[PDB]
Design a protein that fits this description.
By secondary structure, the protein is α/β, with parallel strands linked by helices. The chain has 3 domains: about 290 residues, TIM Barrel (Alpha-Beta Barrel), CATH 3.20.20.80; about 100 residues, Beta Barrel (Elongation Factor Tu (Ef-tu), domain 3); about 90 residues, Sandwich (Immunoglobulin-like), CATH 2.60.40. It contains 10 helices and 23 strands. The strands form 4 sheets. An 8-stranded parallel beta barrel has the order 1-2-3-11-12-13-14-15. The structure holds calcium ion (3 copies) and sodium ion (NA). One calcium ion (CA) binds next to loops. The PDB classes it as hydrolase. The entry lists the keywords hydrolase, glycosyltransferase, alpha-amylase, starch degradation, alpha-1, 4-glucan-4-glucanohydrolase, thermostability, calcium, sodium. It forms a monomeric assembly. The entry is titled "bacillus licheniformis alpha-amylase". The protein: alpha-amylase.
């Protein structure tokens, strides 16, 4: 059975504390549509109750302690999360927890620290002398105390910050005696520093503590894997070691996917090599190709979809997706795949044999931001494609990318899955037909479009070929009737 991931959150969901209960209630629906794993948003205390979760104040507070003015996180309380995870596990759905370990935000107090300013354009270049600043670097977890962990954070557990409280100044500051970590992205010279207080992975105590927390987190929630946040800003060898550590300690496989944000496949292959392919990465280049096709009114050359993507070179180390919380409307990396094209993009990642596909909560249920271009709920257009993946997308694949608009592929089916096999056709322009091979063992079968876009079926000829049709700017997925 094909595995399918679902990112179970959108950036603009309401701060109502009902999310874990919602996830629990969606268990049956997710299972029915073939979702085998869910990536849940950061489950620990952020800078405030409404923090989406990337503020990462206290990794040991999973909506359990009264801190930052709330007990629950934006999503609910720890018990509610535990009940939801129990429900998902009862239906064989795996759970991946978000891991935000690049920085810590919302420090309890400031500390006096000697620092220098570095050039935002080249962080290796110092542009000031040393001076005393007041940095938000003291974390004592006043509500948790020593429960689960007695480790407290001070400025010397970090490399720098972007705020001097004494002067209300926003610059990039490197603390005395610290050096940006390596290896990290080399954008801006060294991209170790992103926001808040940047964790110093050169510090032995910090590395040991983040590993220890990783195990505690996996055990406390009984997680099945992880989604790693902002990895281009975190020492690569540490991420490699952290993933190995958590797997050895838990004895579980712990599927892991990292979000390395780069348009460039080169930067992505370097990261995979440096972490010795021990985990996957989201296929960011593929997302930009989807956005490009959807916005060029038919002018995009669809043959390009086979190249320049992570999945095209590392089929087993790529998590493919259409849109996510970084790319949805109103976000800093906004590059939403237009609605008319969305189902075509979904057909591409859900019915092809390579890559671990991910469905976006915002695409299924809509996004709740306040622009005039929010994503509409498209679950009704995606459900049939999920059905195609769950029941028909098996066996040998044949690709037909011989046209600038109309491209398609087939799956012959596999004898272990009854009636499996399919023929998919997509076009970013005018419709048309394409003769495709689906396997001689399917000779004589009547196949029809499971999406409902075309009503006439296709009969497979004696040599295993069928002539499939697709309407303009549309997708058709034929399966045995
Ligand atoms: Ca960093
Ligand atoms: Ca450092
Ligand atoms: Ca085209
Ligand atoms: Na650092």
């Amino acid at each position: 059975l094909n595995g399918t991931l679902m990112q179970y959150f959108e950036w603009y969901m309401p701060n109502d504390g009902q999310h874990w209960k919602r996830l629990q209630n969606d268990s049956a629906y997710l299972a029915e549509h073939g979702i085998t794993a869910v990536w849940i948003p950061p489950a620990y205390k952020g800078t405030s109750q409404a923090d989406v979760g990337y503020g990462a104040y206290d990794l040991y507070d999973l909506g359990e302690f009264h801190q930052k003015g709330t007990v629950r996180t934006k999503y609910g309380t720890k018990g509610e999360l535990q009940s939801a995870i129990k429900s998902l596990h009862s239906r064989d759905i795996n759970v991946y927890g978000d891991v935000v370990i690049n920085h810590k935000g919302g420090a309890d107090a400031t500390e006096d620290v000697t620092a220098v300013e570095v050039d935002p354009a080249d962080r290796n270049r110092v542009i000031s002398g040393e001076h005393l600043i007041k940095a938000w670097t003291h974390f004592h977890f006043p509500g948790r105390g020593s429960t689960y962990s007695d480790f407290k954070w001070h400025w010397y557990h970090f490399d720098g910050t972007d705020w001097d409280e004494s002067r209300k100044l926003n610059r990039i500051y490197k603390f005395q005696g610290k050096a940006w970590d390596w290896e990290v992205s080399n954008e801006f010279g060294n991209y170790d520093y992103l926001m808040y207080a940047d964790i110093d992975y050169d510090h032995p105590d910090v590395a040991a503590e983040i590993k220890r927390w990783g195990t505690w987190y996996a055990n406390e929630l009984q997680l099945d894997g992880f989604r790693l946040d902002a990895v281009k800003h975190i020492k690569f060898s540490f991420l490699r070691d952290w993933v190995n550590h958590v797997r050895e300690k838990t004895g579980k496989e712990m599927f892991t996917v990292a979000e390395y944000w780069s348009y460039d496949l080169g930067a992505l292959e370097n990261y995979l090599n440096k972490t010795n392919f021990n985990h996957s990465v989201f296929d960011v280049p593929l997302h930009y190709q989807f956005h490009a096709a959807s916005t060029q009114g038919g002018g995009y050359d669809m043959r390009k979809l086979l190249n320049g993507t992570v999945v095209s070179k590392h089929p087993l180390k790529s998590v493919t997706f259409v849109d996510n919380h970084d790319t949805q409307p109103g976000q800093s990396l906004e590059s939403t795949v237009q609605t008319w094209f969305k189902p075509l993009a979904y057909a591409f990642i859900l019915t092809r044999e390579s890559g671990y596909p991910q469905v976006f909560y915002g695409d299924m249920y809509g996004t709740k931001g306040d622009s005039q271009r929010e994503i509409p709920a498209l679950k009704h257009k995606i459900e049939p494609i999920l059905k195609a993946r769950k029941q028909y997308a098996y066996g040998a694949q044949h690709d037909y990318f011989d046209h600038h608009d109309i491209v398609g592929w087939t799956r012959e089916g596999d004898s272990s899955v009854a009636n499996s096999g399919l023929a998919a056709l997509i076009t970013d322009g005018p419709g048309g037909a394409k003769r495709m091979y689906v396997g001689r063992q399917n000779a004589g079968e009547t196949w029809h479009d499971i999406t409902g876009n075309r009503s006439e079926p296709v009969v497979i000829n004696s040599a295993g070929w069928g002539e499939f049709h697709v309407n303009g700017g549309s997708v058709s997925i034929y399966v045995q009737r």
